Amino acid sequence: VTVITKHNDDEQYAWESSAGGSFTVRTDTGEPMGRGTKVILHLKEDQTEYLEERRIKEIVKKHSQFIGYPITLFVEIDQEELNKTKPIWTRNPDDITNEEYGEFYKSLTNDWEDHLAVKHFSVEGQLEFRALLFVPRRAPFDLFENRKKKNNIKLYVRRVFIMDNCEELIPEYLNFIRGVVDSEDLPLNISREMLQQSKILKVIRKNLVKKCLELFTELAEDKENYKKFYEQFSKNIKLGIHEDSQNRKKLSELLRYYTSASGDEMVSLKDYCTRMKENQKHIYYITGETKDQVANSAFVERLRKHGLEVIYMIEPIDEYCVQQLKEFEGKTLVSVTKEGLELPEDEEEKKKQEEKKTKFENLCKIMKDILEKKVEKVVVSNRLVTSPCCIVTSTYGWTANMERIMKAQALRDNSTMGYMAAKKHLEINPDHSIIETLRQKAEADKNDKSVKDLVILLYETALLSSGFSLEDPQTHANRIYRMIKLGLGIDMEEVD
Amino acid sequence: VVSNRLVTSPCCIVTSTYGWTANMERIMKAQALRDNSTMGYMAAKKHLEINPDHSIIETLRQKAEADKNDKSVKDLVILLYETALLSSGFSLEDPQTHANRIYRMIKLGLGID
Amino acid sequence: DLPENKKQALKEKELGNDAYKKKDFDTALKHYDKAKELDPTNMTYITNQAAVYFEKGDYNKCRELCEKAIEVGRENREDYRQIAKAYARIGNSYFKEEKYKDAIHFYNKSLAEHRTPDVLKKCQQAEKILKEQERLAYINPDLALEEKNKGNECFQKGDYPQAMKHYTEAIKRNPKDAKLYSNRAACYTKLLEFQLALKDCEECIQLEPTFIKGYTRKAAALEAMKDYTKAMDVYQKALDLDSSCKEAADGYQRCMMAQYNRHDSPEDVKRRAMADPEVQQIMSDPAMRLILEQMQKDPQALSEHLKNPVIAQKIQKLMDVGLIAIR
Amino acid sequence: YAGYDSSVPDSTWRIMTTLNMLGGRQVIAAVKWAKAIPGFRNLHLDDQMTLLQYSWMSLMAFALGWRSYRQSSANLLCFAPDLIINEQRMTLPCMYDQCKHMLYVSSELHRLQVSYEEYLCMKTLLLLSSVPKDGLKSQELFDEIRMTYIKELGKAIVKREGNSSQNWQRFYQLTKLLDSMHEVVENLLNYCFQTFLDKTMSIEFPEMLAEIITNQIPKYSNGNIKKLLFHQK
Amino acid sequence: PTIEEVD
């Protein structure tokens, strides 16, 4: 290392050293500087890549871009200023344009495409930091060359670049937001462990989350762009609704679902509330594989009859959202496929429902005995209109949709599962002509073969309607074949 | 096609040479997030085989020849198809339509209008 | 529960409400006027009378009433949401008269009183309408020609950034000038802003489908970025218009070889191909993942699956980008 | 995907027998849970089972505690997310003679204003809290695991209360609940031991608890089981 | 080339 210095009011001297315990100084007999210091480094041959114009530009742009004095690179000369502008995040949020945020983002993420939205804010007081949080226009892609680089929010402390991977800076469910955080209180004595134990980092993280949620809300106000956002990031909101127990309320407001009364639009839980019927204390929902399976499901026949709206949840992750969304704006959420569902029914109708339970009490008992080893109970339905029956999931069990996911995972894992199977209830439609016929036969002779066969066939059919697999598809098919051969016969302005 | 593997079942559904097994299909349908264009294609790669000696099939041949569009044939053929998918372990895209076919058959069996 | 005059005002309020349900504007005004005098420290009677004047198209009277209601509500400490509603309605009269700039002013006051979702949406509509009216007022093809011409003087000297600035003013002044879009595209191609060259060339082309230069400028940007597959396709579209065109023919021939010669390392292929959302979808789709595994293991899986376009074109896209090589 | 199993009771005042069916399913779940904690499966099986045999009672009462704290402001026991037993059944002797000790635990989590992280740290600590007086065959690993857990409780508290005096007060007050859980267990187990052996009580047990209780009675009631405390009085 | 021309 060579250091040439000229103090104002002193002589220019040249220091030279190879370390190793020693150095010397000589008068510098070369050209004088007006003032100042120049350092000449004599490089190791394997390190000469650091003299590359490209590498210098990258290093200065990544680590010295916040230096107040202009730094220029002399090459061949062509002289290029490197720290030409202030870091975008240190500039006033009101002056910065969308084009500027756009180019910054592209460089930040190496995303040829523009950003969806950006939140830019700063705080002061007992905590001081500045931050930029960007929402991409596309969800992150599966390529491992991208996934291995997360969490991609750059951290700076006192404008000093610290790192590209900022674990514990933002919750994982929001790890699709790209950005920059520049903290003043966080110590420069950084190691992953210090950061994990830092109360400063903890506070910054909760504040970044709140701001992310504010950005999402602003996007929510814009119907056209919110939909674009939601299509790419709805799963992230949903992961959050499940895990973030404190921001769960704000996250629920961001959910959008198809409903039985939305046509093809996705609507918010607040829109559902605005279309609720008098004395409706519940938000009704159904889960499934497709929109049409749930729309035409037996479980919603009466709800449509009564004019009630039902939320259609058809993404696998929905099975988790419903586990934490116990309430929305004080209304209870209920699954139309689960045990105990009740409607905002009339008192006269409730009496008729009790009369029907009595009328069919004997049938319920007979069917249960036939199916004692198949179902927990047989009861009279308050859900069905045209189906003679359905299979209802117990309150603590898994719906057919969650069981098919668990089973699909077991196949994925090349395993089987040591778990309690969902408990099931069969429900009888008391007004169905098949059911009334059955009541009469069942009472005439409890063990008439045709009673036993009809009950089993209805049970298996009902399992299929509810999305449960059959434990024995060949036997089921054979019952159908028997049925077929018998059928063939071959054996103004607002006012205050 | 006409079956060379069946005896008592009127039919079965056979995975085509390059198709999915029931287990692959179950994983795919249950968990895949898809536009269903490629899934519809793979899902459709199936062969239905006919048991030429089954009494249902023989009855069916006779009806099909008498009237290609007989409504009872269109419904019997679909019912056998859906049933066969289940016996082969494949899910139905719409269990409710299937159930309704069963319910119609039942009410007819019971003398119900 | 109420002072007798408040209850009396309420009974009249309710009768007035029924009169409005039936659109009986004038009976209702009589009821609300009684209610207003019975309980004068209450904006509701004033705003209801305004509701009639708004529905009648009598916007000046309904505005006076809303303003009086606002002054009264503040004196009597009425809910901020009530004040907001009176302002929202004022903004609505201007909205209805198409005075969107005033509708906005009053909606802004409404929002300060309460950021009512209805106001937020209605004021956004007022803004969208006014913004379109302003752009149309801004448009003037002769000023566009003068800015275009200054942009051309700059452009022709190699000063593309300045040319771009003048071209930008020219397009604000004349939005359908296809030639102007392609002149900006040229500025960007020369400055290596190849992506921006593509967006302005695309608008030029849709406006003027026969503008062969729109295609040669776009294709040059694509070729420069080593997107030889689309550059060739764009240069070919240019050839479809004129088979003798020099850039359309020469750029096409360079792309024809370069699109294969550049594959080099698979890392180049992955970084470039996966930039394209279409192949990201092909790879993110598990059905395709299963099909591809069969294809690697069995050339006959390819022979059969490629007979169906839904798969054959997903595969063709992966081949076109260089992700799938066929030997 | 997350979520692997589920369990509920099917009765209210008759929880006097269904608590055992539930305790059976909950201790089994506790075994799966315990195994899921790194290093638990490396413990000798005889000791893994000994610890659930002795700790199942505190894990059950503590599990009820959390749900009660959040669902009924610790006034009622919550046997499962879907079952809360109300006052008209809660004070009956068949319920209350055992349940009053489980209510003590619920009341303390509520008085203490325990976070879920702090709660889980404590549930995890209770898992290894009751051992034979003669020690465990693979005790050295059990001891490392149990001490890791107490350090985790401290961390859960320090990062939540703030200040210094509140960290030690919340820590020691929560720790006092872990220690007093043994007073809860002494009485809750004596109910089970008595109803297991005395046929007069007409109490049914599942195979899981029936094995635990026959193995636990001759050691617990005779003082051959050691109560591990994390704090002094 | 086209990119150095105006229309």
Q: What is the DSSP letter of A80?
A: E
List CB contacts of A99: < 8 A, sequence separation 6 or more. none
Cα C307-C312-C315 angle, rounded to 5 deg: 145
Q: Between chains, do B41 and C288 touch, taking CB under 8 Å as contact?
A: no
The Cα–Cα gap between B107 and A435 comes to 10
Give the DSSP letter of residue B52.
T
- Owning domain of residue A379: 247-496
> Obtained via which technique?
cryo-EM
Whether A396 and D82 lie within 8 Å, measured CB to CB = yes
Together in a domain, A344 and A410: yes
A215 and A267 in one domain? no
Asked if residues B24 and C290 have their Cβ atoms less than 8 Å apart, the reply is yes
The Cα D63–Cα C300 span in angstroms is 58
Task: Report the SS3 class of residue D178.
Answer: helix
Distance in angstroms (rounded) separating the CA atoms of residues B48 and B3:
9
- How far apart (Å, rounded) are the C-alpha atoms in residues D74 and A450? 53
Most E CBs within 10 A among C153, C154, C155, C225, hence the mutation to make, goes to: C155
Instruction: Say whether both A266 and A220 belong to one domain.
Output: no
Q: Tokens 């009277």 — which residue?
A: C61
Secondary structure of residue A392 in the 3-state scheme? strand
Contact C139, C174 (CB under 8 A): yes
Q: Which residues of D touch A199 (CB under 8 A)?
A: 159
User: For residues A102 and A104, what is the distance between their CA atoms, to the nearest angstrom?
Assistant: 5
Find the closest chain A residue to B29 by CA distance: A289
Burial (CB < 10 A; 0-12, 13-18, 19+), residue A431, is: middle
With b for 16 or more beta-carbon neighbours within 10 A and e for fewer, the B45-66 pattern comes to ebebbbbeebebbebbeebbee
B72 phi, psi to nearest 5 deg: -70, -20
For the packed helices A473-488 and A449-465, what is the interaxial angle rounded to 10 degrees? 120
- Interface check A173 vs D, CB under 8 A: no
What are the Cα distances from residue A227, in Å, to A257, A267, A412? 11, 10, 32
How many CB pairs lie under 8 A apart between chains B and C? 36
Interface of D with A in 167-226 (CB under 8 A): none
Alpha-carbon distance C182 to nearest alpha carbon in chain A (angstroms): 20
Is A145 close to C82, i.e. CB distance below 8 A? no
Residue type, A418: G
> What values do phi and psi take at A119, rounded to 5?
-105, 130
Q: How far is CA D44 from CA B68, C92, C160, D24, D58, in A?
A: 72, 78, 78, 21, 22
Chain C residues whose CB is inside 8 A of the A218 CB are none
Contact B59 A488 (CB under 8 A): yes
Q: How far is C-alpha D127 from the chain's CA centre?
A: 7
CA distance A146 to chain C (A): 10
Q: Are residues A202 and D7, on separate chains, in Cβ contact within 8 Å?
A: no
d(CA B25, CA B38): 12
Note whether D touches A: 3 CB pairs or more under 8 A.
Answer: yes
Residues A203 and A117 in one domain: yes
Cα B35 to Cα B28, C290, C310, C313: the distances in Å are 12, 15, 11, 15
| Closest by Cβ to C287, choosing from B17, B18, B42 | B42
Determine which of B11, B12, B31 to mutate to test the interface with A (most A C-beta atoms within 10 Å): B31
Task: Report which of B51, B56, B26 is spatially closest to residue B39, judged by C-alpha positions.
Answer: B26
Q: How far is D9 from chain A (nearest CA, A)?
A: 10
Contact D82 A199 (CB under 8 A): no
Q: What Cα–Cα distance (Å) separates residue A235 from each residue in A149, A229, A240?
A: 20, 11, 8
User: How far is CA D62 from each of CA A495, D55, D181, D209, D227, rounded to the nearest angstrom?
Assistant: 56, 11, 8, 18, 16
Q: Residue D72 in contact with residue D78, Cβ under 8 Å?
A: yes
Q: Answer for the pair D40, D34: CB distance below 8 angstroms, yes or no.
A: yes
Instruction: List CB contacts of A178: < 8 A, sequence separation 6 or more.
Output: A105, A108, A109, A115, A133, A134, A136, A152, A153
User: Residue E7's closest chain C neighbor by CA?
Assistant: C179
Q: What is the DSSP string of A171-204?
A: -GGGTT-EEEEEESSS-S---HHHHHT-HHHHHH
- Chain A residues closer than 8 Å to C43 by CB: 496
Q: How far is CA A33 from CA A8, A10, A14, A30, A166, in A?
A: 10, 12, 12, 9, 43
- Answer whether C152 sits within 8 Å of E6, measured CB to CB: yes
Sequence-separated (6 or more) residues with CB below 8 Å from residue A474: B87
Rounded CA gap, C174 and C166, in Å? 12
Round to whole Å and give the CA distance between D20 and D11.
11
Q: Do A493 and C55 touch (CB under 8 A)?
A: yes
CA–CA gap between residue A135 and residue A216 (Å, rounded)? 9
Would you tell me how many other CB atoms lie within 10 Å of the CB of residue D13? 16
Tell me, yes or no, whether A391 and A450 share the same domain.
Answer: yes
Cite the DSSP H helix spans in chain D. 15-36, 45-71, 87-90, 93-112, 116-127, 139-161, 165-197, 207-220
DSSP state of B2: B
* Tokens found for residue C54: 């708004």
Contact A247, A210 (CB under 8 A): yes
Report strand pairing: A331-335 vs A12-17. Answer: unpaired
Which DSSP category does A95 fall into? Answer: T
What sign has the CA pseudo-torsion A424, A429, A433, A436?
A: positive
Q: Are residues A305 and A429 in the same domain?
A: yes
A492 chain-C contacts, CB cut-off 8 A: 20, 23, 25, 51-52, 54-55
B18 CB-contact burial (10 Å; exposed 0-12 / middle 13-18 / buried 19+): middle
According to DSSP, the residues that pair with C233 across neighbouring strands are none
Chain B residue with minimum CA distance to C305: B18
Instruction: Please give the Cα distance from C248 to C231 (Å, whole number).
Output: 10
Q: Backbone dihedral region of A39: left (phi > 0), alpha (psi from -120 to 50 degrees) or beta?
A: beta
Closest A-chain CA to B23: A411
d(CA C83, CA C78): 8
Please name which of D130, D151, D127 lies closest in space to residue D228, comparing C-alpha atoms: D130
B→A interface, C-beta within 8 Å: 9-10, 23, 26-27, 29-31, 33, 55-56, 59, 76, 79-80, 83-84, 86-89, 91-96, 98-99, 102-103, 105-110, 112
- A130: annotated binding-site residue? no
Q: CA torsion angle for A427, A432, A436, A439 (degrees, to 10)?
A: -10
Asked if A312 contacts A286 with a C-beta cutoff of 8 angstroms, the reply is yes
Query: Most C CBs within 10 Å: which of B17, B26, B38, B45, as the mutation test of the C interface?
Result: B38
How far apart are the C-alpha atoms of C46 and A495, rounded to whole Å? 10
The DSSP string of A110-152 is: T-SSPPSEEEEEEE-SSS-EEEEEEE-SSPPPS-HHHHTT-S-
> Taking a C-beta distance cutoff of 8 angstroms, is the pair A442, A362 a contact?
yes
Fill in the DSSP letter of residue A49: G
Type of residue numbered C180: L
Report the neighbours of A using a cutoff of 3 or more CB pairs below 8 angstroms. B, C, D
Assess contact for B25 and B43: CB atoms under 8 A: yes
Residue A350 is classified by DSSP as: H
Is A395 touching D (CB cutoff 8 A)? yes
Give chain B's contact residues with C (Cβ, < 8 Å): 17-18, 20, 24, 28, 31-32, 34-35, 37-42
Residues 6+ apart with CB under 8 A from B59: A488, A490
Is B109 within 8 Å of A487 (Cβ atoms)? yes
Both tokens of residue C60? 């000046």
Distance CA D171, CA D154 (A): 6
Q: Are A272 and A323 in contact (CB under 8 A)?
A: no
CB contact under 8 A, D2 and A320: yes
DSSP states along C285-298: -HHHHHHHHHHHH-
The DSSP string of A421-449 is PPPEEEEE-TT-HHHHHHHHHHHH-TT-H
Searching chain C, which residue's CA lies closest to the CA of residue E1? C247
Chain position carrying tokens 């062509």: A78
Cβ pair A361, A351 in contact under 8 A: no
What are the backbone angles phi and psi of residue A75, rounded to the nearest 5°?
-130, 160
Task: Check residue E2 and report its DSSP letter.
Answer: G
CA–CA distances in Å: residue C309 to residues B37, C279, C287, C312, C316: 10, 16, 15, 5, 9
Cβ proximity of A454 and B77 under 8 Å: no
Q: Which residue of C280, C289, C290 is the best one to mutate when testing the A interface, meaning the one whose CB has the most A CBs within 10 A?
A: C280
Contact A494 C52 (CB under 8 A): no
How far is the CA of C57 from the CAs of A240, A446, A492, B62, C23, in angstroms? 49, 75, 11, 75, 14
**Does A293 lie in the same domain as A404?**
yes
The neighbouring-strand residues paired with A4 are: A14, A38
Neighbors of chain D with 3 or more C-beta pairs under 8 Å? A
Q: How far apart are CA A104 and CA A89, in angstroms?
A: 10
Token match 């609507």: residue?
Answer: A267
Nearest Cα residue to A164 out of A156, A172, A174: A156
What residue in A sits closest to B83 (Cα-Cα)?
Answer: A477
A318 and A389 housed in the same domain: yes
DSSP three-state, residue C208: coil
Q: Based on C-alpha coordinates, what's the Rg of chain B?
A: 16
Q: Tokens 């970044």 appear where? A: A208
Q: Which of C278, C280, C281, C285 to mutate to test the interface with B (most CBs of B within 10 A)?
A: C285
**Locus of tokens 């849970």:** D33
Q: Do E2 and C220 touch (CB under 8 A)?
A: yes
Mark whether A179 and A258 lie in a shared domain.
Answer: no
Chains B and E touching, counted as 3 or more CB pairs less than 8 Å apart: no
Contact A374, A462 (CB under 8 A): no
Residues of chain A in contact with residue B93, where contact means CB-CB under 8 angstroms, are 290
Q: Please give the interface size between C and E, counted as residue pairs whose CB atoms are below 8 Å apart.
A: 31
| Chain centroid to CA C311 | 34
What is the rounded distance in angstroms from the CA atom of residue A148 to the CA atom of residue A369?
57
Q: Does D158 touch chain A (CB under 8 A)?
A: no
Tokens of residue C288, six digits: 């395709």
A187 and A266 inside one domain: no
Determine the Cα–Cα distance for residues A133 and A121; give it in Å rounded to an integer.
9
Instruction: Specify the amino acid at residue A486.
Output: L
Q: Do E3 and C190 touch (CB under 8 A)?
A: yes
Cis status of the peptide bond prior to A151, with omega within 30 of 0? yes
β-pairing, A257-259 with A36-40?
Answer: unpaired
Q: List, as one string, the DSSP characters of A262-291.
A: STT-EE-HHHHHTTPPTT--EEEEEE-SSH
Nearest to A10 by CA among A32, A39, A38: A32
**Residues whose CB is less than 8 angstroms from the CB of residue A321 and which lie 6 or more positions away in sequence, other chains included:** A238, A241, A242, A255, A313
Q: Which amino acid is at A202?
A: K
Tell me, yes or no, whether A310 and A181 share the same domain: no
Cα–Cα distance, D149 to D139 (Å, whole number): 15
Regarding chains C and B, contact by 3 or more CB pairs under 8 A is answered as yes
Which residue on chain B is closest to A288 by alpha carbon? B30
Phi, psi of D202 (to 5 degrees): 50, 45
Q: Is the domain of A185 the same as that of A256?
A: no
Q: Give buried/exposed letters for A123-153 (b at 16+ CB in 10 A, else e).
A: eeeeeebbbbbbbbbeebbeeeeeeeebbbb
Residues 6+ apart with CB under 8 A from A479: A453, A456, A457, A460
Helices (H) and strands (E) in chain B, counts: 5, 2
Calculate helix-pair angle for D207-220, D165-197, nearest 10 degrees: 100
The dihedral region occupied by A156, where left means phi > 0, alpha psi between -120 and 50, and beta the remainder, is beta
The three-class DSSP label of residue A31 is coil
Q: State the residue for tokens 């390190």.
A: A47
Beta-carbon contacts below 8 Å between A and D: 28
- Closest approach of A332 to chain D, Cα-based (Å): 14
Intra-chain end-to-end CA distance of chain A, in Å: 83
For residue A36 the two structure tokens come to 């100042």
- The SS3 assignment for D227 reads strand
Calpha distance C32→C46 (Å, rounded): 8
Regarding chains C and A, contact by 3 or more CB pairs under 8 A is answered as yes
